[PDB]
Design a protein around this ligand. Structure first.
Ligand code: 8T1
Length: 123
């Protein structure tokens, strides 16, 4: 149907915008601490602590499969990256502090992304 196609076009547009947001957010992690999943080989107890791991590579895979239907779903995964890290690692670690900086700097990007999704009407 034409309606289905139109819906798919909107999703494709959302995916394009979220790809830009994702690139901007990942730029705020220059250490690449959050680039890849935490290695379960190197951190064998990780899943005892963290029930829903997340990282930028995993987000990018979902994004390219057009698996984010709206911005909230994308934000939920970004928040997992930060929140998981701030629980597993103590305040006096480079990991926790990287997450705080990513949260603080990412908030600016997400603030405007929300306005853009709303104004263009991508959800
Ligand atoms: C425990 N942990 C995190 O929580 C986040 C990122 C990270 C990166 C490496 N390379 C090792 C451990 C890590």
């Amino acid at each position: 149907s034409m309606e289905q196609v139109a819906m798919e076009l909107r999703l494709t547009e959302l995916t394009r915008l979220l790809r830009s947001v994702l690139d901007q957010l990942q730029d705020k992690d220059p250490a690449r601490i959050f680039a890849q999943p935490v290695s379960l080989k190197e951190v064998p107890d990780y899943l005892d602590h963290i029930k829903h791991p997340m990282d930028f590579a995993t987000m990018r895979k979902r994004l390219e499969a057009q698996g984010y239907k709206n911005l909230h779903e994308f934000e939920e995964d970004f928040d997992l990256i930060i929140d998981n890290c701030m629980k597993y690692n103590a305040r006096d670690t480079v990991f926790y502090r990287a997450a705080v900086r990513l949260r603080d700097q990412g908030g600016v990007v997400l603030r405007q992304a929300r306005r853009e999704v709303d104004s263009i009407g991508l959800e």
